[PDB]
RNA sequence: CGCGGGGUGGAGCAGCCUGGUAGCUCGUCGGGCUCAUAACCCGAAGGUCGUCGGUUCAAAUCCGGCCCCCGCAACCA
RNA sequence: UGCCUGGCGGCCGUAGCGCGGUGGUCCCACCUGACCCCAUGCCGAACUCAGAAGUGAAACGCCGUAGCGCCGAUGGUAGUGUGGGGUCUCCCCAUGCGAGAGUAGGGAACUGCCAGGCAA
RNA sequence: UCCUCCUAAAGAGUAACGGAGGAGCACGAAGGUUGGCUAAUCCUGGUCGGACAUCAGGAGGUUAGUGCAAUGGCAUAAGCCAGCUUGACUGCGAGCGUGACGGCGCGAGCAGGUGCGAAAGCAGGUCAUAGUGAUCCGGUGGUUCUGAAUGGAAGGGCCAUC
RNA sequence: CCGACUUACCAACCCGAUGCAAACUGCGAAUACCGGAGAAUGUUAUCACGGGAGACACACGGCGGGUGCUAACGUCCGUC
RNA sequence: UAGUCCGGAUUGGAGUCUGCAACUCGACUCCAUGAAGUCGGAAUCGCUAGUAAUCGUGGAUCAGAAUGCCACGGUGAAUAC
């Protein structure tokens, strides 16, 4: 009966903590939104998280609900 | 509540503006003394703020509770940040209908200069 | 038989029995039979060491099951190939780790459920002793 | 709104020497009434519940608000979002006249009438009765009906209590066996 | 299953078209979008077609 | 209220038949004749009659008639 | 062990595919006809849909476990 | 400068609930009324406007209380990277890392920009 | 063949005739935006009304809902209702993720033009992840790009599309 | 009909106490992996492009697991 | 032309008569209540004249207690090829 299984989306979180990026790449590719949109970060219709400026990663933990932000400085 | 209802559905709107660096105008809205004041992008201090409880706009009007006071708030407001030389800012309903006073407040802004 | 009303699934993983256990203290009663030896106990065998062990109390004395099943163990049907999938779930065994009291007895003398105790023990396949509640 | 002017003045004070209380805004107002006559059997009818839309404008003197079906229950053949029954909640000044027109000729008018019932409350300061026939009304001519379709009056008060509920409703005379 | 495949019809000059589907069995009306006509390149109220 | 689709709420002449007339807003039409108002009820003597009303021994004294 | 079908008033069978409402014949019960029975005519009752759980607004039905029955399969050395 | 109050935040349960007391000069809320702006898939509840007699009940703020929530060591234990050993379905030894729970205890927040009232 | 969880040993990936379940669509609105709103289930009271229709309040608190299986997520709601609407748009696209590759996915921003909103802004589908097949061949509309002497045409090409 | 009391019994929900979970998480390591800086060390051990390949039956031991009987010099993976 | 001023059952209350005695178990009266039933399935009965049909009365039995039985008269058919 069993023996069906899906192929691997390959999600998680591409670049980390104090990674510099480009405007553009993907900081997290994930399913629903475990990390939100902080500050020149957006977010896709896939929930992904890119970064819309040149610097670094920086995760934070902001929030009344303590809900993880990803937030990109200037670097 | 009828002031923690109000809250939320300014929640959308903060939210939204801090991210994109804009400095808004929040104005609070009260069945006397309509308030106004422009924060900087920080959202942490006011760089210009005006309203009724000043005894420099209560004395020149008839009551500090309707329309023609709101007028003279948005006045106030968008003649003294002209003055700072806060030129384009952002307009912050705070959960309040834009439809009287908070109408009001925008509309003699807008004339003053006060870009938005 | 010890039996779990309807579980989530079916058919469980093998899994390792490594560790200590953790229902270490006599909390309800006052005299204890805590398992030594590291196993796995069917329950066909808690609940024969219950019948040879609410025979030598009496309908006297109140006995406390300190384990519960709750892990389905497959077992395939003889002259069938490897493969095909997982057998079928025949009986449901609880792993025991060193220092899970078995048993609880209260309402006795010590000596009787000394040798009351010592019936159960007989039944099980993993070496037991005998524990005393102690004041904290 | 001519009784009222009598809760402005008289009823008020009548309580601040019951329960003493150390506001004059502490005394019991009754906030609004609500009218609901949840029909049910359109289910088989449709222009049964149009009907029913009808006497509520007459009970009351405005438009009533077809309700829809909160959940789906197959235990009376409903289904989610199917209008089953028509409210009127009514306040202001509008709800006075109601009030008024509701204990003074129509509950007197109410067939078999003993009384009312005491122990009505739901132990908060509400009160809900409930009417069987609806001609007790002036407003149906007893000859333009064919049904006796009757509704539940929820009264809504500001009291505390069940305790308090009835000592703001006492006033009005409200019959009470 | 059910649901065809149409043709968006600009209703302007050009034969320029949106193709998109239809419940044909539920609805019984036709569609007027007006989409963006990149000929003509304003907005015209486009029709159904096969 | 939501202008034109409510119905007709004109004050009213209402009066029953012991003198009590009482004008009132309705949706009737021109006036209204009233039967028993709250002031002419029976309630004040609706509940004497039903509770004291029984009694067996002072039945059959009518009869014993000594 | 596997594949496929079935289990419905006292009897034998429809309905299940494509969920909300269960029907036919016999038998039973009551009446009539006849000297009486059978036959014949009239009227009515009667179903936990094997069983437990789940899906759902709603399960006889859709899905799963178990019990019973039926046919097929259980092979090459 | 200090007590108050309102707004926008920082930080986000040591920061939230429960119980009790308490504030109205300002402010806030409730509140009065509704031709008109606007309004309810009925209704000035809400939204809105025009005002303001009355109130601090409700609401909110503040102070106390730990009845809960919550935070939380030291020590030990569980686990474990690497190298060895054993009665090797599981443990032990050497070195490094070191929980969770529980206990002592902490605890009914802290703080910044502006604008008013107030004693000065 | 594709999607969800576990197996999988806290990046990604990771096998078996291992354990558990679904898809081969739906929608012109269930899409976009603007405004507003926020549950399930019990307890009490109430005409027909009953374990369960509608109504009022409390408790409770997201145990609800989310077009559909599962997981992640959600009130700043992505859940619910209403007004106006077609951005379910054309030409692109720095820069990244994912694969042997074919291929798949995300995308700020630029120009044309458009919708909603007072405005900031948001919209090139739907909370996300399934709902799908390469090439060839041939059909349909458009575009003078070519068109085997020359002018046309047939037929090819390119674009849209079956 | 209303409807009170009682019971050799079973027991919903809350409360205190006690265990279990691959498909439970109000917690949470050790390692491993990604990025930055720094020294030493290594015949550049690194990446890209091009010429040539082979290879795509794997086995055993340790550790972490699925399956089997925590049976198999069993079978299938992770890593050495 | 309706379940109606049709129909009168049932039931509550208050009464009367006979009788030692009216609860089980009488008849009649007053007020109230006012259902079934809107011409009846298969099937089946009576009757040819003053009969059928319909109306009312009397008597026996009997303290009281009939729509039964026996008897009387009023109005008075249809059809028999
Ligand atoms: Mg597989
Ligand atoms: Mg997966
Ligand atoms: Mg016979
Ligand atoms: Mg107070
Ligand atoms: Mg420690
Ligand atoms: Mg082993
Ligand atoms: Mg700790
Ligand atoms: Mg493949
Ligand atoms: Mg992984
Ligand atoms: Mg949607
Ligand atoms: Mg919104
Ligand atoms: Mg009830
Ligand atoms: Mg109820
Ligand atoms: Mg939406
Ligand atoms: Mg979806
Ligand atoms: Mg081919
Ligand atoms: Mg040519
Ligand atoms: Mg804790
Ligand atoms: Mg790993
Ligand atoms: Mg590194
Ligand atoms: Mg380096
Ligand atoms: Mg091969
Ligand atoms: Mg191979
Ligand atoms: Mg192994
Ligand atoms: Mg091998
Ligand atoms: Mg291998
Ligand atoms: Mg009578
Ligand atoms: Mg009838
Ligand atoms: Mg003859
Ligand atoms: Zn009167």
New binding site residues.
């Given amino acids: ?26 900081i997290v ?6 990390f ?1 949109a902080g500050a020149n970060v ?7 998280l ?4 040149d610097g ?1 990663v920086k995760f ?8 993880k ?1 990803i937030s990109i400085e200037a670097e | ?18 991210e ?1 660096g ?1 400095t ?1 105008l ?1 104005v ?8 106004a ?1 422009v ?1 900087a992008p ?10 009724t ?5 209560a004395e020149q009007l ?9 007028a003279a708030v948005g006045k106030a407001v968008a003649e003294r940040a002209l003055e700072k030389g806060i030129k384009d800012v ?15 407040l ?1 509309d003699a802004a ?1 004339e003053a200069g006060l870009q ?1 | 038989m010890l039996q779990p009303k ?1 579980t ?18 006599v ?2 009663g006052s005299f204890g039979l805590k398992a030594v030896g ?3 106990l069917t329950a066909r065998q808690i609940e024969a060491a219950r019948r040879a062990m609410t025979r030598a109390v009496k309908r006297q004395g109140k006995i406390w099951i ?3 099943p ?2 389905p ?5 003889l002259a ?1 190939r ?7 779930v025949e009986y449901w ?3 025991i ?2 220092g ?2 078995l048993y609880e007895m209260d309402g006795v003398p010590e000596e009787l459920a000394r040798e009351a105790f010592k019936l159960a023990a007989a039944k099980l396949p993993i070496k037991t002793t005998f524990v005393t509640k102690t004041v904290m | 709104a001519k009784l ?1 002017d009598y809760y ?1 003045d008289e009823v008020v004070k009548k309580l601040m020497t019951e329960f003493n ?7 019991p ?1 009754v ?2 009434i ?10 088989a009818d449709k222009k049964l519940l149009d009907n029913a839309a009808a006497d509520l404008a007459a009970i ?1 003197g ?20 199917y ?13 006075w006249e109601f009030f008024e027109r509701l204990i003074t000729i129509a509950v007197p008018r109410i067939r078999d009438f003993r009384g009312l ?1 005491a ?14 026939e ?1 001609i007790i009304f002036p407003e149906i001519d007893y000859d333009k009906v064919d049904r ?7 009264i ?1 008060t ?1 009291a ?1 209590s069940d305790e308090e509920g009835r000592a703001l409703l006492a006033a009005f005379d409200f019959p009470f066996r | ?3 065809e ?4 019809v600009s209703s302007a000059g ?10 044909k069995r ?2 019984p ?1 036709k ?1 007027e ?4 006509d ?2 003509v ?3 015209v109220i486009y029709k159904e077609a096969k | ?3 034109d ?2 119905p007709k709420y004109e004050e009213i002449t209402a009066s029953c038949s012991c003198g009590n007339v009482m004008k009132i807003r309705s949706t009737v039409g021109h006036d209204l004749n009233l039967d028993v108002c709250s002031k002419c009820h029976p309630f004040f003597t609706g509940k004497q009659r039903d509770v004291a009303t029984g009694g067996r021994v002072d ?1 059959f004294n ?2 014993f008639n000594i």
């Fill in positions: 009966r069993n023996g069906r299984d899906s192929e691997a989306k390959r999600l998680g979180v591409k670049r980390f903590g104090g990674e510099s990026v480009l405007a553009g790449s993907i590719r994930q399913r629903g939104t475990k939100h957006g977010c896709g219709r896939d929930h992904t890119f970064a819309k400026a670094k934070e933990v902001k929030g009344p609900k303590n809900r932000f | 509540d009828k002031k923690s209802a109000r809250i939320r559905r300014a929640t959308r709107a903060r939210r939204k503006l801090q994109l804009a808004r929040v609070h809205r009260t069945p006397r003394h309509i308030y004041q924060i920080n959202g942490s201090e006011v760089l210009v703020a005006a309203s409880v000043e005894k420099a706009i008839k009551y500090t509770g309707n329309k023609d006071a709101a952002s307009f912050d309903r705070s959960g309040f209908q834009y439809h009287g006073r908070v109408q009001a925008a807008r938005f | 309807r989530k699934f079916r058919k469980m993983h093998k899994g390792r029995n490594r560790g200590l256990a953790q229902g270490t203290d909390s309800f590291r196993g796995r300190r384990v519960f709750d892990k163990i497959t077992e395939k049907p069938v490897m493969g095909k999938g997982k057998g079928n065994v609880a792993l780790q060193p899970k009291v | 009222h402005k209380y150390n506001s004059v805004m502490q005394v107002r906030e609004k609500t009218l609901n006559m949840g029909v049910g059997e359109a289910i009351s405005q438009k009533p608000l077809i309700t829809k079906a909160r959940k789906s229950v197959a235990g009376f053949k409903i289904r989610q979002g209008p089953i029954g028509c409210k009127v909640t009514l306040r202001g000044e509008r709800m019932s122990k009505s409350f739901d132990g908060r300061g509400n009160y809900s009765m409930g009417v069987r609806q006796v379709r009757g509704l539940d009056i929820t809504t500001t505390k | 299953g059910i649901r495949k149409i043709k968006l050009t034969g320029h078209f949106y193709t998109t589907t239809k419940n539920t609805k009306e569609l979008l007006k989409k963006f990149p000929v390149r304003q907005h | 209220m939501k202008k689709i409510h039945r009518k009869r």
